[PDB]
Design a protein around this nucleic acid. Sequence first.
DNA 1: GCGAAATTCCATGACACTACCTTCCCAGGAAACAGGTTTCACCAGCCAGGCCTTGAATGCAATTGTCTTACTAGGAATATTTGGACTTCCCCACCTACCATTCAGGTAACTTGATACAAACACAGCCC
Length: 59
Amino acid sequence: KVSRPEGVKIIPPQSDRQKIVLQAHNLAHTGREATLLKIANLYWWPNMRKDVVKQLGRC
DNA sequence: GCGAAATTCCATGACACTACCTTCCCAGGAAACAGGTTTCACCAGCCAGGCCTTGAATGCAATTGTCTTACTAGGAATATTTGGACTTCCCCACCTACCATTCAGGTAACTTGATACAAACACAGCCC
């Protein structure tokens, strides 16, 4: 759990890094930015964008 | 102040109704085919003799062709009478277009099975 100036956001576990982004990627098959703003509704953690790039090279 | 991290930036490309069409490739295999060799047996070509069929000449008989007349029915014009094809309007069921599912058939293979052909000896039918 974490607090942000736009509301309360959620820090997911380290085992739940690839699963939480891949289920947000495949919702609209977006790239780097519209993928990222989906995760900016529930989650937040340091280096979000290092994992989104980790997705798209396999997608 | 450097570095790490979180963020904004901006240059760009693709969407505009789409499939065919042509020529060469590839390809595997197969299709036979076009090419060619090989051999044996048979069908075609050769020629003549005898006979039968065709052609011709003919005389004649009835068949057929023409002429003539009394006439029957065909056609046309009529009125009408009657029998219907197509135009019309509307609705429903049936065919289609579709996907998923499954079954059946075609190819294919291995086996089997059964019949037809080829051969030989004899029988019967028809003809000289």
